[model samples]
Target: GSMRGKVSLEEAFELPKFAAQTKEKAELYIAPNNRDRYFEEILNPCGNRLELSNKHGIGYTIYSIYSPGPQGWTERAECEEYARECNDYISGEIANHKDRMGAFAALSMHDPKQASEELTRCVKELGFLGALVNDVQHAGPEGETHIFYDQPEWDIFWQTCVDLDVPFYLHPEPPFGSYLRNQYEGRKYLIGPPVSFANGVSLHVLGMIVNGVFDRFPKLKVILGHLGEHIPGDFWRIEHWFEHCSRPLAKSRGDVFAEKPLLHYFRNNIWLTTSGNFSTETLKFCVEHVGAERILFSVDSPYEHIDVGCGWYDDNAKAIMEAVGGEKAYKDIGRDNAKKLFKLGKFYDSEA
Candidate 1:
């Protein structure tokens, strides 16, 4: 990718050196100890797989937080411990690599209560910008279904996010039960984060919007990774259908579903990051649907190669800029949006 125009704010935090691209180097950066091969072979590979570059197209190391699984949430102590470990690791990396890197938390919201508490602690105590909350509560005992925002019990979690002023990122996890299973059982790859996760999280966002969560907590920032979890593209149709339909299935006041109910929140309060969505067409569509300001740059590293992700953005930056019709919009999507939404300066500013 050719370096053109002023370097974007996203390019500032690149890997320090290209030599640090190996798995061994990533292990050294993330974790040196190996209590099990799973940590070294699986987790380590997952963290260091992506290689991000700086403003000058040089590679820089980035620290990533691995999320906990269902077991980490079944018990309160375990959930707290996982959160502590995540906070410690991510915060330490951010503190140590302040000038050279930035970090993100992949939080597991297996239990909304515990997950919210841990996420709040991470942002306030550990200085995390925000959390990538796994949408599904995971397969529960006796196969009970769990959807966080849909249930009234999770309102406190939403309020907590508002209080913390950190974005509650809704990442996707697998859907359970016959309803989803019938649709996704054989489609293992599709059932994973790409399709199932997007569907589930989009529904959760819809739940939040229709239930008037935003009307209550207007300041709450929610991030939907993977290009608005595939919502932005089809939002107009959703709004159209909702407007025309007078069926009993409808839940909200008139026209709440008009032209993507979520798009309003998405443009105003929600943000979509470019995680695993590297296509130019998709990027253009997202910008068109939600406006460039609502989009952020993310690599979905470990899952996707950082260099490739960076290259995609670098290659598409001009097109995106042209589409948005300004340098400021590019800057907003590339950097300022995250900065303003997460208050990144509090972590970096001496005054704060």
Candidate 2:
């Protein structure tokens, strides 16, 4: 049977330890400087409608990542500092909330060499399991716009990830103004992740796949949050459209997918998390589109309220299970998928 009313793993992790903490304290601890924005935008409304409560059964293994800059570049020294900061942050959070938290180092390196060095250090020195890689690299000199995975310079970074045996999450960041501003300039309401972030990251993922990055680094695991950035639904269309039309050929090495490009990559090399995607219908569709193994539980914390997000998952698990037609499917996506992808056995046991 599907569990009724589940909270987000993040909320389950952060809220339990502090008994007297109010919404302000929660937001402050979560994103200290942006407490007001967090409440105004996310918590206030979602809290009222969702009937959020602390008793909801949601298990989240909280992980932290650094926010990207305007141009999407993070400096080498800063990355090192971030790794240390992340280590300390996770350590402290886990010490207090050990039962609910799982820590991983995040690196937003733009320069391939720096990224490789820092990531290697993070895994070996800091004991981090994996990293969160921002999609765009804004490392070029002043005049350049942004660098992407399709570029040859990133091979070393990708190679390092493979050698390290650590998963890399290709998290979303802002797009170049040339592409985004022109489209969403006036619509302030539609300017955030809902529109821009998803589109930009999806293109970046497509770029990496089409460029044959996966062919060379077959073992490399790439993670995309927000239900594969709406990719699974359009996988077939992207493949067929490219195959049928020769007008503007994709800048790929060759016909990458002998059977099916998008489906093959999505099922085999990639995984998606349910971060900020709370709709039961979309969740069900994603499970159907990409098998349960490809999905993992996540909540875009601070951006999305934990209680409301968790409630949706807890409330919708049954519908999702029925859509996929089994308890194994729920177990796979809920925790097993994440455990295998990130190799979290040290923290999460077999049952987790």
Candidate 3:
């Protein structure tokens, strides 16, 4: 088995200042005991993190600030400044390992205009591939209101992504406010990656598709992790009900209706990553539904072991190879798709 080159997206990191601010809050989601280890690993990207990647044949990793970092902050100015500083911190870290690392900017999603400008700075100056936003932006005095990017107000941010030719990674965050309390009051075990993460992210992705976000910015590219957050596996049922129930509900509001089938956006505007989901069956299903060209390999590191994800990937190479048609397609899923999506031609020319 040759594990020579791989590119894993959805890897995470945390700045020291940001970690201090959110360490307590993390206890609500993560086991309080594991929080320290999680913080240490995320905070130390250059240490064992990179060493493990080299050992696993992960030639490159695109890191982003852990979820609910700036994405949960309510204040616009504080969030914007925190995002800027966080990007600068991660940028500096990437500078040290430029050959093996890249970044996805943490954005101030409260203000779409500021988010667009910040994304511009990250791409143009810091050389980040794009931004990774934790599902919804927390708003209101006590985070009572949630801000989702499906509405018309976020056009500026979406357009900026298109103009820069970068993909926006829609990562998951734990459900909060009444949504969390009402939905999973007693069943809190599902609150993170188990079930709630996919629930929250899949809803937002469907919101974007149904709200015509892709229709407005046809060139805009968005990435979803965890094998498309359970979207692709249920696309048939989703598309069926959407056509029957959703279209007539918004009969007069043309903007609310998607111009094409829901799968059209999934196939064209959206890409799925194998971050934290190590299933060969789903990989084959995604290849059949979303196509192999749109799927990328990722580890969702720190939370998931790089060794486990990479080892599983290499172990199942023959399975994915046959499912994707041949060896070329298998490599495309493991490395080339990410390089193409992130425009990493220059990095690989010197090393690949």
Q: Model 1, range 124-229, lDDT digits (tens) per residue? A: 6666666655565543553354646655667777788888777766666555567556887676556655567678778888877766778777888887778887
Query: lDDT of candidate 2?
Result: 0.60
Model 3: CA > 4 A from native: 21-37, 252-255, 346-352
Collision count for each candidate, in order:
7, 5, 0
Residue-level lDDT for 113 in candidate 3:
91
lDDT of 1 at 273: 79
lDDT of each residue in 161-219, candidate 2, tens digit only: 89998877777755445555666556644544667677878988888877678877888
How many Å off is the CA of 280 in candidate 2? 2.3
Candidate 3 local lDDT, 88-154, one digit each (tens): 9989888988888899999989989989999999999999999999988998766778999999999
Candidate 1 segments exceeding 4 Å error: 1-51, 55-77, 100-113, 176-181, 246-260, 346-352
Error of 2 at 296 (Å): 0.7
lDDT of all predictions: 0.56, 0.60, 0.85
Best model per TM-score: 3
By lDDT, rank the candidates, best first.
3, 2, 1
Candidate 1's error at 304, in angstroms? 1.0
